[PDB]
Write a protein that binds this ligand. Structure first.
Ligand code: CLA
Ligand code: CLA
Ligand code: CLA
Ligand code: CLA
Ligand code: CLA
Ligand code: CLA
Ligand code: CLA
Ligand code: CLA
Ligand SMILES: CCCCCCCCCCCCCCCC(=O)OC[C@H](CO[C@@H]1O[C@H](CS(=O)(=O)O)[C@@H](O)[C@H](O)[C@H]1O)OC(=O)CCCCCCCCCCCCCCC
Ligand SMILES: CCCCCCCCCCCCCCCC(=O)OC[C@H](COP(=O)(O)OC[C@@H](O)CO)OC(=O)CCCCCCCCCCCCCCC
Ligand code: SF4
Ligand code: SF4
Lengths: 35, 80, 31, 741, 157, 74, 143, 41, 94
């Protein structure tokens, strides 16, 4: 496939960075007291 | 905080009041039944929703109804 | 003729723009 | 004061007046069957004597008579077993060839092609292969002939009639008073020595004068029809001396304290008999004599009508320490006035004993030609395991019942029960944590192995080849037992069981017993067993400890022991009673026992049972347990899928019945799901529509049909779930073992 | 005649009991001398100590059980793994601090077992948790770094 | 404790249920606080547009993955 | 002529050895309840939190978490020892609010002078249809 | 005697006796007329 | 609480009647050495702000991407390594 390096960067981004960021943001938002 | 309602079909048997485990209902004077008393729910904030009052009502249909609504620290029966 | 790397990069950029439009629609729906 | 026989004359009249009035025992069942719920309530409270009356004397009398009736039923069952073994069996032929003829004691009639179930067991006989082990028991007892079995069956019928008469006599003629039942000291003294001790001594006597000579001749090789009759050995010291020379001296050595002379028939060898594959009958005789003496001595500790003896109340009240405040005070009053507490203790120890029996019986086969009978071994082990599990769950249920009805705070102040009830939160929280830790470190290991195997990384698994989890403690104990003879047991010629190690004991070309090596798979399965047992204990203990009150419901005791809930308030109180805790504990017990029996079956088929061909041992499954039991996929494929081919291919043969039940059980189990995932409202409304249809045609019944109560729905669901699962395992086990054993 | 189990601070209507496991003199001293129970010590220093200990004890597991445990470069890979774990539990501490401390309220006072009034732990504050979280990062990363050095040094190992 | 922006009653729940029910009742626009018929229809219309865009993106992703790492030509 | 009786802090508590089912951290930041009764003798009773306590001869005070626990204890005292008690609600700030015997007369007995709160003058089936009150944060029972 | 006959007339006793009689009749029908796949008259 | 006898309730000392005790806390400012404490508080100077401390966590996110694009290949991960031959399939397929 063209640009074999792309999956090695996108898979961890969508499975590790994006989920951690999304969970942290959701946790901080669902307990804001004043949204 | 559940919604407790009393209807004119009540006969004033006072069974629902005795069956309440959180003291939510009480008997007040009335003139629509032979007992000359009607049930009331002045402290609905303390109602947990056990529906014990409905299991004791002998009228058909029930004269006392509990509609579960927004849950609070008291309605959920939480001691922690 | 397999797709080249530049094509993948262009597709990813267009997807980024589409995602921006999607987040804008989501924000509008939240309001 | 003073233990005596106190009885009331003619308390209940004998007539059929109450037989025509169903529901006479209950006061709430007097308004008649207005709805169908009355019919179910009639059976759900038939044996709940605590509700039928408030007098403890009447309850005790009812329990005594019920016990007599149960004894009569058991005697009828025993009589049927002996009669079938004497008229519809091949026991006589099996005696001449116990290694090739398969025991059979049931014959079916030819009605709708079912005669195919009459298998060719052997000895010119056709019937159903039995796995109860009655043939081995009878052989160990020296039955030899079928006339003796018929005589035993008739005697059992007479005993059943005597038991029923005893129950009727003690309930309608001479009913014991309450003070008679509360004689725990006298009851224990009689049950220890007069029952267990005397029974063991009598059995030892029979074994000495009947089992030893007949079995010795059978083992040496003599036709069963040529062996002398039991009375010819019991009343003739000359022949018995010909078989056992120590008998030429009579009873003189016993009274002169020169017991060594009796070493020929009172040995302490060990291991198993190489001819029959079972324990040495002389060793069993010595064991029974020793335990009989021990029990007889133990039956003299409690005080009765004389000064000598100990007092249960005095001993209990004297055991108090700094960590338990008052101690065991009040326990005597609880165990002498509450039948449920005694039932709980007895059921717990009784079930534990049944489990111990299953273990000791497969480890050390006590009957001749029993170890080589793989079907009988597996059947006995599984049956006793299930009985033990059920009894334990019942023990928890009755403990909760006592805590709900017979508990009295004024009598249990600062004692063991009160202190336990005052810190139930800590107990439950710690048990919950240990259950979670065990579940993780036990099941997650299997999941990790599955993931590694699927990812192509077998070197990262928890196996004997990669990360090893050797059970060093179990292996050490096993080797210690193997080295016990001549060291920590000088008078022992061999170990208790060949499983500890040593040579292979094979009978008739089949392995009767051999060392059982423990590896990583054994470690994993043992931790799985510990985890399941802990979860079951957590459920039962939580129900017993919170049966009275809880933070959610402070007056749970007022609602009773068996109630569906406390409404949808507080988020939901569904299944909050103790009965519901027992309902869930039943499922967890089923899961635990199922895993236990699966482990036993696979381990014996892969590392014990097999054939000897002068070149090694050819196990049934080839030893795939040590390399596949570390993953769930291995259990599903190498055990469930591989061993199920025997039951799914039994159609058209004698084992076809096992193939039918195997499916039928699968149905019942699934049927249970209907009652487990549903509610009462849906069925009540559906019944309303059906009732309208009936009313439209003037065929509506007066006994208003009602949906099963919430508690009844749960009971039906759990009963069907366990029946289906247990029957499925039963059919699978029996078909597999009867086709490859 | 001695009763080693007493109600918590003599009050028998509080969901707690005093046992030789909770009220033991040595156990109480050791538990009270931990960095978490230091009302008078700066939260940053306590966080540094906690992070150092946790980061150091967190290398071992991956060293002897990681996917690359059978390779000479296992120590480095594990040092990085512990650093990642420390950073993860770091963001966990930050999220907990941002959610827990976001408002103020006239809370009830705090006293000792004897009845001596003491101020609330500064760690239970918006700025107190932030300082504690920052110290945990420096200490946690340092502990993981020291874990790799110990592998290279330590003549026995 | 005010995440269920569409349900003021759920926001007052001090238990974890507030979060649970806060996600299971997000699409029940008719039961949200201060909801009218016009706003309900407009929200549904916009949600339909979002769903259509999601379907188009899914199809585009399938095509892109087949053309990038597949063997369609072979 | 009834006035809510004030809560005396000098009332001794029943003899109890302690338990893990007592007050937690909710009573420090939310609220708790107090039940005070009068006993004619020192006797053993069952506590709603588990275990057995001994009520002294005279005034007794017991602090619990939920109001249901206090009411359950009161029910036990009324149906077992024929003892009448009073329940109060205490907040962390220090406010005491009278509860259960609101007007000195038990709720099961009519007192003539109470509030007839939540009492509809219709039948259960005479409520408004759910479609007639759509787009309104109210149930048919509140009309 | 009246009470005994009344007990024998109860729903469970009558149900078991009726089921036993029906099962016995069917078993004997299949014993004397076996393998009746169709109604050959 | 004024628990001088059997009274565990006190409105004037309601703080002690709700079990609000530290149990193990102890205030003491004499422990960590001044020279070592200064070093650590100095190292974690500006890292006490939510935005700045999150930045340190963001570095971990960059390391994750760095591992996939470089770290995974340097540890010779099987997924980033090569492949050997292949199979045909059940029938005449590929
Ligand atoms: C819904 C369609 C869809 C789906 C299910 C997938 C799924 C996948 N993609 Mg892909 N992708 C898509 C669309 C999709 N893609 C489109 C339209 C493009 C063109 C720009 C790409 C370009 C792309 C590349 C370059 C790569 C992947 C890769 C992957 C694989 C790993 C995911 C990853 O980390 O990459 C990240 C994916 C992206 C950065 C772009 C995807 C954006 C889509 C459209 C978001 C859709 C969100 C959805 C509609 C809303 C659902 C809600 C949900 C988020 C909770 C994975 C199997 C990687 C791979 O090949 O693995 C070996 C890889 O390197 N995709
Ligand atoms: C207590 C357990 C028990 C069990 C489970 C069985 C089970 C069985 N018995 Mg058995 N039996 C038992 C006890 C038991 N028996 C005892 C204690 C005796 C001694 C009296 C007998 C004597 C006996 C004989 C003589 C026969 C059986 C037979 C049978 C089989 C068919 C029974 C049948 O359908 O007949 C009919 C079903 C009916 C409902 C009619 C029964 C009518 C009797 C007289 C009622 C008596 C009360 C069956 C598998 C038969 C058999 O083995 O077939 C080869 C057979 O002929 N049994
Ligand atoms: C013909 C003899 C006879 C007669 C006329 C009576 C008559 C009476 N008995 Mg009695 N009893 C008898 C024998 C008799 N009994 C025997 C032998 C025992 C010892 C077990 C008892 C023990 C006994 C007790 C403990 C009690 C009575 C009671 C009673 C009175 C009402 C209960 C009743 O009978 O309901 C009807 C009972 C039945 C119709 C049968 C009961 C169910 C049987 C035993 C089940 C057998 C199991 C069977 C194998 C099926 C299980 C498996 C199956 C699923 C295949 C009644 C006047 C009760 C009483 O006094 O009322 C307060 C009382 O509690 N009896
Ligand atoms: C040496 C005296 C003796 C013996 C042998 C027994 C034996 C037995 N008792 Mg018993 N008991 C005794 C003394 C004795 N008891 C005394 C002194 C008291 C008063 C404190 C009691 C009070 C008592 C109660 C309350 C109960 C028993 C029960 C039982 C049976 C338990 C069933 C079992 O698992 O055993 C195995 C079963 C057998 C071995 C069946 C064979 C039965 C033979 C005939 C033994 C009969 C022994 C008997 C005492 C002989 C005297 C009776 C005579 C007047 C005809 C069992 C047969 C329980 C029971 O099931 O009720 C029947 C039960 O509920 N006992
Ligand atoms: C309850 C178990 C039991 C029973 C019924 C018997 C019965 C018998 N044994 Mg025996 N025995 C037993 C256990 C038993 N044994 C055990 C455990 C051992 C191992 C130590 C032995 C070892 C043994 C030897 C070596 C011999 C016997 C022999 C005999 C026979 C004659 C002995 C005798 O005294 O007559 C019957 C005994 C009784 C009736 C017991 C009654 C109790 C007292 C004494 C009478 C009543 C009390 C009195 C009035 C006071 C006899 C049939 C002798 C024999 O003839 O060989 C065949 C023989 O040599 N036994
Ligand atoms: C010595 C053993 C023993 C004894 C004497 C008792 C005695 C008692 N139990 Mg108990 N129990 C036991 C063991 C025992 N139990 C065990 C082992 C368990 C675990 C399963 C339980 C769990 C249990 C519960 C949960 C409850 C009791 C209850 C009771 C009381 C009322 C029983 C009753 O009349 O209900 C009626 C009896 C029946 C309806 C018999 C039905 C038999 C089952 C449902 C059918 C099973 C099928 C069978 C295996 C055959 C299948 C073939 C089929 C296809 C035909 C009673 C005093 C009840 C109670 O309220 O206590 C006060 C209560 O709810 N028990
Ligand atoms: C709706 C389902 C259903 C139907 C339509 C049938 C139909 C039939 N079955 Mg079957 N069967 C069924 C379910 C069913 N079965 C189930 C669930 C099982 C498992 C237990 C069996 C097991 C079974 C066996 C083992 C056999 C049959 C046989 C038969 C045939 C014999 C007819 C007969 O008895 O002669 C005529 C009967 C009468 C004229 C009596 C009519 C009057 C009665 C008494 C009225 C009853 C009123 C209540 C017949 C065509 C037999 C056969 O030979 O197959 C061809 C046979 O051997 N069945
Ligand atoms: C969905 C995305 C995803 C991704 C991209 C990964 C990626 C990875 N996992 Mg993971 N995993 C995931 C989901 C994911 N996992 C889920 C959902 C679970 C739960 C079922 C697990 C459970 C799991 C376990 C139990 C383990 C892994 C391990 C690993 C690592 C493989 C071994 C290795 O490369 O050596 C080592 C990896 C590195 C040297 C690079 C990681 C460190 C980077 C550079 C952080 C930089 C921060 C820096 C210090 C500042 C790898 C980085 C193994 C591991 O080694 O743990 C890390 C391992 O033990 N995973
Ligand atoms: C993808 C996005 C990547 C984002 C990267 C963010 C990095 C963090 C950042 O910028 O912080 C910005 C803050 C701003 O502080 C500020 O620093 C200012 C001074 S100056 O501006 O930095 O000169 C100061 O005046 C102010 O008070 C203070 O708040 O700067 C710092 O204080 C960072 C210093 C980090 C020191 C610790 C490093 C780790 C130590 C590990 C120990 C063991 C390791 C072996
Ligand atoms: C693997 C062992 C299998 C058992 C599981 C152990 C886990 C259970 C842990 C729960 C502990 C709860 C504490 C209760 C606290 C408690 O009960 O109060 C303390 C208790 C009370 O004793 P008293 O002084 O009151 O004694 C007066 C008594 O007569 C009245 O109870 O004394 C004990 O210490 C009991 C021992 C508990 C510890 C049991 C462990 C025993 C070790 C056995 C080791 C076996 C293997 C090694 C052999 C070589
Ligand atoms: S639902 Fe329960 S708490 Fe509410 S009024 Fe009825 S009985 Fe009282
Ligand atoms: S139970 Fe029903 S009839 Fe009786 S007082 Fe209450 S509402 Fe009226």
């Amino acid at each position: 496939m063209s640009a074999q390096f792309l999956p090695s960067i996108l898979v961890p981004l969508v499975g590790l960075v994006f989920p951690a960021v999304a969970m942290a943001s959701m946790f901080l938002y669902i307990e804001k007291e004043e949204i | 905080s559940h919604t407790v309602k009393i209807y004119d079909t009540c006969i004033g048997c006072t069974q629902c009041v005795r069956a309440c485990p959180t003291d939510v209902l009480e008997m007040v004077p009335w003139d629509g039944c032979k007992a000359n008393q009607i049930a009331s729910a002045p402290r609905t904030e303390d109602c947990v929703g056990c529906k014990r009052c409905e299991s004791a009502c002998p009228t058909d249909f029930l004269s006392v109804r509990v509609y579960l609504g927004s849950e609070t620290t008291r309605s959920m029966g939480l001691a922690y | 003729m397999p797709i080249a790397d530049y094509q993948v990069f262009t597709a990813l950029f267009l997807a980024l723009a589409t995602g921006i439009f999607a987040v804008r629609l989501g924000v509008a729906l939240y309001k | 004061k003073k233990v005596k026989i106190v009885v009331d004359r003619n308390p209940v009249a004998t007539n059929f007046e109450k037989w025509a009035k169903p529901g006479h025992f209950s006061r709430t069942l007097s308004k008649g069957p207005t709805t169908t719920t009355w019919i179910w309530n009639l059976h759900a409270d038939a044996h709940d004597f605590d509700t039928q009356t408030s007098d403890l004397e009447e309850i005790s009398r009812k329990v005594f008579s019920a016990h007599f009736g149960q004894l009569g039923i058991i005697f009828i069952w025993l009589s049927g077993m002996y009669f079938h073994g004497a008229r519809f069996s091949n026991y006589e032929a099996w005696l001449t060839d116990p290694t090739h003829i398969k025991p059979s004691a049931q014959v079916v009639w030819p009605i709708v092609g079912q005669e195919i179930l009459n298998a060719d067991v052997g000895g010119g006989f056709q019937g159903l292969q039995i796995t109860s082990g009655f043939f081995q028991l009878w052989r160990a007892a020296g039955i030899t002939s079928e006339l003796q079995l018929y005589t035993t069956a008739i005697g059992a019928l007479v005993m059943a009639a005597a038991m029923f008469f005893a129950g009727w006599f003690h309930y309608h003629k001479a009913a014991p008073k309450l003070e008679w039942f509360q004689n725990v000291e006298s009851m224990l003294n009689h049950h220890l020595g007069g029952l267990l001790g005397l029974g063991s001594l009598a059995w030892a006597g029979h074994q000495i004068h009947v089992s030893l000579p007949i079995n010795k001749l059978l083992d040496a090789g003599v036709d069963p029809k040529e062996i002398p009759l039991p009375h010819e050995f019991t009343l003739n010291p000359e022949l018995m001396a010909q078989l056992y020379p120590s008998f030429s001296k009579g009873l003189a050595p016993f009274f002169t304290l020169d017991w060594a002379q009796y070493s020929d028939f009172l040995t302490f060898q060990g291991g198993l008999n190489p001819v029959t594959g079972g324990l040495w009958l002389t060793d069993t005789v010595h064991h029974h004599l020793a335990i009989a003496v021990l029990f007889l001595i133990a039956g003299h500790q409690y005080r009765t009508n004389w000064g000598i003896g100990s007092s249960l109340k005095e001993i209990l009240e004297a055991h108090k320490g700094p960590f338990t405040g008052e101690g065991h005070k009040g326990l005597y009053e609880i165990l002498t006035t509450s039948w449920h507490a005694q039932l709980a203790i007895n059921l717990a120890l009784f079930g534990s004993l049944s489990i111990i029996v299953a273990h000791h019986m497969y480890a050390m086969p006590p009957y001749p030609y029993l170890a080589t009978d793989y079907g009988t071994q597996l059947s006995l082990f599984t049956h006793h395991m299930w009985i033990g599990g059920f009894c334990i769950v019942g023990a928890g249920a009755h403990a909760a019942i006592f805590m709900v009805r017979d508990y009295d705070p004024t009598n249990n102040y600062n004692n063991l029960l009160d202190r336990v009830l005052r810190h139930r939160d800590a107990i439950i929280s710690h048990l919950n944590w240990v259950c979670i830790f065990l579940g993780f470190h036990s099941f997650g290991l299997y999941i990790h192995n599955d993931t590694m195997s699927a990812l192509g990384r077998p070197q990262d698994m928890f196996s004997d080849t990669a990360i090893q989890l050797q059970p060093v403690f179990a292996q050490w104990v096993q080797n210690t037992h193997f080295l016990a003879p001549g060291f920590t047991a000088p008078n022992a010629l061999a170990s208790t069981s060949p499983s500890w190690g040593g040579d292979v004991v094979a009978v008739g070309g089949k392995v009767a017993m051999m060392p059982i090596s423990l590896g990583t798979a054994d470690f994993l399965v043992h931790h799985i067993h510990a985890f399941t047992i802990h979860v079951t204990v957590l459920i039962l203990l939580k129900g017993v400890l919170y049966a009275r009150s809880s933070r959610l419901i402070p007056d749970k005791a007022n609602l009773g022991f068996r109630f569906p809930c406390d409404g949808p308030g507080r988020g939901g109180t569904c299944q909050v009673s103790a009965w519901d805790h027992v309902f869930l504990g039943l499922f967890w017990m089923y899961n635990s026992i199922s895993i236990v029996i699966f482990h036993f079956s696979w381990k014996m088929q892969s590392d014990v049972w097999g054939t000897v061909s002068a070149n090694g041992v050819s196990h049934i499954t080839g030893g795939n347990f040590a390399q596949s039991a570390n993953t769930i996929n291995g259990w599903l494929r190498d055990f469930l899928w591989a061993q199920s081919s025997q039951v799914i291919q039994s159609y058209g043969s004698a084992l076809s019945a096992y193939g039918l039940i195997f499916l039928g059980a699968h149905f019942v189990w699934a049927f249970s799901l209907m009652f487990l995932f549903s509610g009462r409202g849906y069925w009540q409304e559906l019944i309303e529509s059906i009732v309208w249809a009936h009313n439209k045609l003037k065929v509506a019944p007066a006994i208003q049909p009602r949906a099963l109560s919430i508690t009844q729905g749960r009971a039906v669901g759990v009963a069907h779930y366990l029946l289906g699962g247990i029957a499925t395992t039963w059919s699978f086990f029996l078909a597999r073992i009867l086709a490859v054993g | 005649k001695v009763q080693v189990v007493q109600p918590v601070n003599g009050d028998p209507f509080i969901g707690m009991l005093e046992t030789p496991v909770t009220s033991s003199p040595a156990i109480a001293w050791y538990l009270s001398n931990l960095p978490a129970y230091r009302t008078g010590v700066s939260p940053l220093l306590r966080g540094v100590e906690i992070g150092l200990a946790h980061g150091y004890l967190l290398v071992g597991p991956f060293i002897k059980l990681g996917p690359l445990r059978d390779v000479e470069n296992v120590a480095e890979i594990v040092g990085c793994i512990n650093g990642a774990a420390t950073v993860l539990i770091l963001t966990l501490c930050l999220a907990y601090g941002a959610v827990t401390f976001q408002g103020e309220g006239p809370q009830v006072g705090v006293k000792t077992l004897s009845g001596r009034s003491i101020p609330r732990d500064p760690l239970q504050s918006a700025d107190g948790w932030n300082k504690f979280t920052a110290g945990f990062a420096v200490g946690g990363l340092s502990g993981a770094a020291w874990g790799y050095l110990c592998t290279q040094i330590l003549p026995y190992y | 404790k005010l995440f269920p922006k569409f349900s003021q009653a759920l926001a007052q729940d001090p238990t974890t249920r507030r979060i649970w029910f806060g996600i299971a009742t997000a699409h029940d626009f008719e039961s949200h606080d201060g909801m009218t018929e016009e706003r309900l229809y407009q929200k549904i219309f916009a949600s339909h547009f979002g769903q259509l865009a999601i379907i188009f993106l899914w199809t585009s992703g399938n095509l892109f993955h087949v053309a990038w790492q597949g063997n369609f030509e072979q | 002529a009834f006035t809510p009786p004030t809560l005396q802090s000098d009332t001794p508590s029943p003899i109890f050895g302690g338990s893990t089912g007592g007050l937690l951290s909710q009573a420090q930041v939310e609220e708790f309840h107090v039940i005070t009764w009068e006993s004619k003798k020192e006797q053993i009773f069952e506590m709603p939190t588990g275990g057995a306590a001994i009520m002294r001869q005279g005034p007794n005070l017991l602090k619990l978490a939920r109001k249901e626990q206090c009411l359950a204890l009161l029910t036990q005292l009324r149906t077992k020892f024929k003892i009448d008690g009073y329940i109060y609600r205490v907040f962390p700030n220090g406010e005491v609010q009278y509860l259960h015997p609101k007007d000195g007369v038990y709720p099961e007995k009519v007192n003539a002078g109470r509030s007839g709160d939540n009492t509809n003058m219709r039948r259960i089936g005479q409520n408004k249809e759910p479609v007639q009150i759509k787009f309104s944060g109210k149930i048919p029972a509140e009309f | 005697m009246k009470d005994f006959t009344t007990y024998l007339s109860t729903a469970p006793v009558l149900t078991l006796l009726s089921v036993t009689v029906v099962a016995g009749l069917l078993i004997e029908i299949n014993r004397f007329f076996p393998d009746a796949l169709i109604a050959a008259f | 609480k004024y628990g001088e006898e059997s009274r565990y309730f006190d409105l004037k000392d309601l703080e002690n009647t709700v079990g609000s005790w530290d149990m193990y806390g102890q205030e003491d400012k004499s422990r960590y050495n001044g020279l070592q404490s200064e070093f650590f508080e100095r190292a974690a100077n500006g890292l006490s702000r939510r935005e700045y401390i999150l930045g340190l966590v963001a570095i971990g996110g960059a390391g994750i991407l760095a591992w996939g694009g470089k770290g995974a290949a340097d540890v010779r991960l099987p997924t980033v390594g090569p492949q050997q031959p292949a199979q045909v399939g059940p029938r005449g397929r590929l």
